[PDB]
Amino acid sequence: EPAAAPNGISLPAGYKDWKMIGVSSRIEQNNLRAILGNDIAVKAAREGRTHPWPDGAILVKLSWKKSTHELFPSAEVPGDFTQADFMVKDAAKYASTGGWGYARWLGMEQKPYGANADFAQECMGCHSGAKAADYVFTHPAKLP
Amino acid sequence: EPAAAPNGISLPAGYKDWKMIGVSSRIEQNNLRAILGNDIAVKAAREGRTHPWPDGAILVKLSWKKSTHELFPSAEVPGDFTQADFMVKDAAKYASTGGWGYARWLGMEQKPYGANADFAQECMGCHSGAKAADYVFTHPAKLP
Ligand code: HEC
Ligand code: HEC
């Protein structure tokens, strides 16, 4: 498997098979993103158990560069895979970063992100803004 | 159970638990979309067996109106759920519409779309542009 993140978090195996929580696009990143979760995170998302999210929930955000469909040029679609971002809920273990273990792996090569074991402070620079929602921006997409 | 589509196709049960094939955004629709598939479709997508897609593959496209995150205005995120669009592969049964059974259900109330049993001719009006790719536009997103 890929190397662990600098804070010791291992890449969750088989995350590409996880169920969908939502999707997004960031104007400044020129990307498309999928937000998936493990079974605990998906149950929590669906039942609104996000105040706080329960221990063991793992969220993944997958990002691709925007590209356009040759046969349909107004369709913005995934190009190159850029990264997999994770948040692992463990209120006690990760109390210093809002109860979440942050980790990122870059590209198809799955290179662990971060200069040192303190790298998650970057993530917290933005995710602190979402403190009222237990540090999670994503609102689970509505489905029947 | 939601009413069947005008061509007799029943709403696939449990589609929200299906694995991710990709995501998209249509500039003219002001939306965000997820593309999921049943496990027949997902295996085909991952192995590149999409010439043609195997019988029994079901693709679903879920659409939400774009909305912006209150805490991060440049993050385009799902608002209202607009529709679930399906293609069910059955080369023999749906030979008249490219080997796919098309069907759409609207909104959280899951109202079947289509004026009459011939509604899928609309879908074909665009999807015929993709005939050389077995009537499917989506290129499965790349993941490691
Ligand atoms: C999305 C994210 C997710 C999904 C959970 C969530 O909080 O919605 C993960 C697992 C993750 N990020 Fe964070 N991120 C930001 C925003 C606004 C969103 C929601 C909109 C969207 O889908 O794009 C996020 C913002 C930021 C940010 C501000 C510039 C930074 C610096 C980060 N994110 C950093 C990180 C991480 C540090 C390595 C990390 C593991 C993240 N994000 C995980
Ligand atoms: C996406 C779609 C999917 C996913 C499979 C695929 O072909 O990619 C389904 C199940 C579906 N649609 Fe079709 N559709 C169009 C385009 C360009 C894309 C790819 C880009 C994206 O993700 O947005 C599609 C185009 C059109 C179109 C041209 C204006 C029409 C009229 C339709 N689509 C119509 C239908 C349906 C008729 C009711 C139907 C069941 C569809 N699409 C299913």
Residue numbers in the entry:
A (entry chain A), B (entry chain B): 18 to 161
What did the publication describing this PDB structure actually write?
Cytochromes P460 oxidise hydroxylamine within the nitrogen cycle and contain as their active site an unusual catalytic c-type haem where the porphyrin is crosslinked to the protein via a lysine residue in addition to the canonical cross links from cysteine residues. Cytochromes P460 consist of a homodimer with one haem P460 per monomer. The oxidation of hydroxylamine is a key part of the process of nitrification, whereby fixed nitrogen is converted to biologically available forms such as nitrate, in a range of bacteria. Here we describe the evidence for a novel double crosslink between lysine and haem in the cytochrome P460 from Methylococcus capsulatus (Bath).
The optical absorption spectrum revealed a large spectral shift relative to the as-isolated ferric form consistent with successful reduction. Crystallographic data were measured from this reduced crystal, yielding a structure at 1.33 Å resolution. In the crystal structure, the haem distal binding position was vacant, consistent with loss of water molecule upon reduction. This results in 5-coordination of Fe(ii), which therefore moves 0.2 Å towards the proximal side of the plane of the haem. Instead, a water is 3.1 Å from the nitrogen of either pyrrole ring A or D, with an additional water 3.1 Å from the nitrogen of pyrrole ring C. Residue Lys78 only shows the single crosslink between its sidechain nitrogen and the γ-meso carbon of the haem (CHA carbon), not the crosslink between its CD carbon and the C2A carbon of the haem. The second crosslink (Lys CD–haem C2A) is broken in the crystallographic ferrous structure, causing the terminal (CMA) carbon of pyrrole ring D to change from methylene (–CH2) to methyl (–CH3). The experimental ferrous cryo structure showed a CD Lys–C2A haem distance of ∼3.7 Å, indicative of a single crosslink structure.
